[PDB]
Design a protein around this ligand. Sequence first.
Ligand SMILES: NCC(=O)NS(=O)(=O)OC[C@@H]1O[C@@H](n2cnc3c(N)ncnc32)[C@H](O)[C@H]1O
Ligand SMILES: NCC(=O)NS(=O)(=O)OC[C@@H]1O[C@@H](n2cnc3c(N)ncnc32)[C@H](O)[C@H]1O
Lengths: 530, 530
Amino acid sequence: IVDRAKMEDTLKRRFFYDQAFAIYGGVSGLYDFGPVGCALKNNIIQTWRQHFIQEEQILEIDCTMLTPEPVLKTSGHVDKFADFMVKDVKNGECFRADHLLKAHLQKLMSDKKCSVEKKSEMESVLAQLDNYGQQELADLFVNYNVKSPITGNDLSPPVSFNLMFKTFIGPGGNMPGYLRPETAQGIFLNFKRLLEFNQGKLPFAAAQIGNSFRNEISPRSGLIRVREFTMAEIEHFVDPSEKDHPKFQNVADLHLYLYSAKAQVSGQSARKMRLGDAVEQGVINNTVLGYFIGRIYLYLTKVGISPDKLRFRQHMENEMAHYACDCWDAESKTSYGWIEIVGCADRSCYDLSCHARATKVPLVAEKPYVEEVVPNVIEPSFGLGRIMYTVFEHTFHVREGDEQRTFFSFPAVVAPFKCSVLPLSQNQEFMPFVKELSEALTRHGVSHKVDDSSGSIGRRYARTDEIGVAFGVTIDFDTVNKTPHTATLRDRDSMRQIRAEISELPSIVQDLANGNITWADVEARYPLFE
Amino acid sequence: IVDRAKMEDTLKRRFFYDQAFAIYGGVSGLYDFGPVGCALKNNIIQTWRQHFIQEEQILEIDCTMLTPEPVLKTSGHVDKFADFMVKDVKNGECFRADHLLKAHLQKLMSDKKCSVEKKSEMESVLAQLDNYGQQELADLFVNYNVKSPITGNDLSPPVSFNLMFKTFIGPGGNMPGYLRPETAQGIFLNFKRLLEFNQGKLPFAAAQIGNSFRNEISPRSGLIRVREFTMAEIEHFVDPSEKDHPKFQNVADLHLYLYSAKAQVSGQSARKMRLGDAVEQGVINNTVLGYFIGRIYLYLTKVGISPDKLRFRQHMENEMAHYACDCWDAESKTSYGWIEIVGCADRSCYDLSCHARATKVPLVAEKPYVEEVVPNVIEPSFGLGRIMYTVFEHTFHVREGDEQRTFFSFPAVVAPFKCSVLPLSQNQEFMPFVKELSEALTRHGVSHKVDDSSGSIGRRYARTDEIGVAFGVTIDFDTVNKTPHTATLRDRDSMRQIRAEISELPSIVQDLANGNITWADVEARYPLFE
Ligand SMILES: NCC(=O)NS(=O)(=O)OC[C@@H]1O[C@@H](n2cnc3c(N)ncnc32)[C@H](O)[C@H]1O
Ligand SMILES: NCC(=O)NS(=O)(=O)OC[C@@H]1O[C@@H](n2cnc3c(N)ncnc32)[C@H](O)[C@H]1O
């Protein structure tokens, strides 16, 4: 339970992000990222690069965003990539059918005038919604009588609205195209010279961190639903017969909530298994999937998402992507209910096949006489957008002081900047102290900023906390005067302080942020301070 | 003089970049960046961030790419933003008039059958080409009889083809839009909450590093002309009466080639002045411009561009951008002649004005009773695309050995990775040595990679040089056997080596890359090696 109202308000005021083209009414599904937003957004794509590209020697490429017609036709995107949209036959108002029906039903199950017998039934209708194809969705839009949310008119019948943006490359209109709804296609259309890098042998994973455009219908989900976003995608090309990851054992003992395809059809709660077991019982196909699912958990977790508000639901036979046979999503429980933030497909040969065929250009590899194969691709797609957002809600708190102060408990690895050095006076009695501390902190690789903002120390740290700055060091007169020179070390969340030799503080703040020491350990080592 | 042929071939083979959607014939003006390309492309945007955002406490934001109709109409982009295109009345073949006429004339001046009197005249026609508006360009396209380059047919009359891509945001067609041809607009539409950050006082500069789409007509300039690219843009909001930069004196003593607007009309060569003087004589308006022009020089230079193949040409009264009153470009002499790689506008109030008006939302500041003003914006726009390319040609060399080996002399600050550790055998006699060296190099912050590729040491370093890896350390038997343990330190360009205690090498390779020591200094300190 979080305060979407109060939070959005804080986030936009400190300018983590806000509405794009504000002074024009703004466009739905489009937002701009302000300074702290950028800082935090770049800390996540950075933490990610380590956790994946670095930790897996993943090849990286940077493809185009403008894709020409054929490429997306071959991938079958021009076809199956779209959402069901309806529109009241009055004014041209559109709505994503998929969701409107869900909104209606919740309204019905919520009205006390409902028989527990129908309520239980409707749930069952929502717990399958993504499987509902053109027809079933058509009928349902009749039985339940779905009508325009506003001025309840009569919605047209569910239709298919392709989510890809449309444009024409170059003068004229001979070469039409779209804005890549995913980065993957580029990583595929480059398979040949990519295999080469890994010596033609599998497995090997390529990757991309760039934008994708998805002309959504009704962006009303805040940052969650946007028509333009940055996504990190890994394309793990493995040999079909070797769908077995060598590192699995590292993420084997993780105990994470899983919501199998069965548990969804056998209408039962998601279990909190162990990856190792989850694979034994054949819940999670192979180990390649398992490893990634494990890492994906370690990442989302490390960035800031709460272990208890995260899970992995599997897709349904027809909820499936138009390019996968099996797939698990990383869902984060938020004010918008559970929401997919990271996807883990298992698109089997379907990609390189389509392209190899359509162009008559062979896309394969070899193995030890030396047989040829079409690498199956397990693809972990990250919605850096929705991820940073989950981190927002999962770590947004309210200082328990009438005043109504709000702080973010961002892990030291994603905080706008780890420490905030703040002295009382600006005079020269302090500079020689602030200077050193800064340079010393710099030497220790600790992102920091010297505070200036007017106000009592406690009012200062108010803003520092506002944007989740991990720590803070107070430099007062006693720091300058008394000898030895000690400053105040203040933990963000607790607001508890520690007096300590301003010389050691750096190496300490470092150990704290790097997870090498606990706040408690500090209170045990150093004298407190009020 | 460079070998575009041989170079492009090398660049694409090592996969710095290549043609987008290759297995489909590919699209013109679109390319994909492979691994080394990315590594180098990220070293430049990184080196840039320091040189500017860091060194100038520049605020950073990340706006949308999809812009809605009004925004670009207000900026006057829907109007004046386009290139003159012609097309033979036979097949629908297009060409950018602006250039075709230039191609023709060069052909005429090149044919020996021309009177030195006409040749001199035609030049004068090219040395004004960007000023030629609809009419003048129309007449000229007649007099000289410009006809289709291929199958010389009859080109239509010069027309205006808007360079912005076109799409519709959301279902329907009520909300049309384009893909931002520049990042700036976003930095402007966010001025209010941006001024706020700097305490409402000027000057203060915002910035953005993202993509912009320019639906060019005839992309045939390789990477130079592309329909999609990453550009770093700084929006320096200064008070009209205070167009005087406090740091100028730092870049005052720089002596750089300038090609004033006059020198272009007074048909004379560009002078190699000094920024300080250049401002005295009122050649370069104010100092704000001067400082940036200075930095822009230091950057491009530091990244790899040759001091002698770089200059700053000013715009002409009607070559001017549709938003500037004064402007200087950073031109780099290349195989495609001089080409603008970095732009330095002086768009006076024109931006915030248009938007303030059109929306009726006031955009101003105050100064010490406390008067209000509309900040003038000096904007340094960087074409990270064309910049990295200039770096390619300006540092592409051919090993003087029949064999035909090609190396890149990339500054240690942009090289794919500074050092390349390479031992002879893979056995355990070496690992304990390779391991340490790597970790030690890591500790020193020196990007490196342990070589494996099969081949004689000299064949190995061949590939290392291919992609401009600054240095190389050879670990042989004597390194393992003999005591002390010394390895071979090899400079890329010279190929000259140095035998030295494998323990010190790290701190050394560091000092070398960080520009703290010279190769010569090393040869003087340590024993040579052949
Ligand atoms: N290349 C395979 C692929 O397309 N996978 S997927 O994108 O369909 O699935 C993964 C989801 O993509 C991201 N995503 C989707 N639509 C949005 C949105 N409108 N706003 C923000 N983030 C979004 C989600 O963050 C991530 O969970
Ligand atoms: N925001 C102000 C603005 O629009 N400035 S400007 O872009 O018109 O001028 C600066 C130039 O923009 C970049 N640029 C232009 N067109 C291309 C291209 N087709 N390929 C690659 N790079 C290009 C050039 O690298 C850079 O010199």
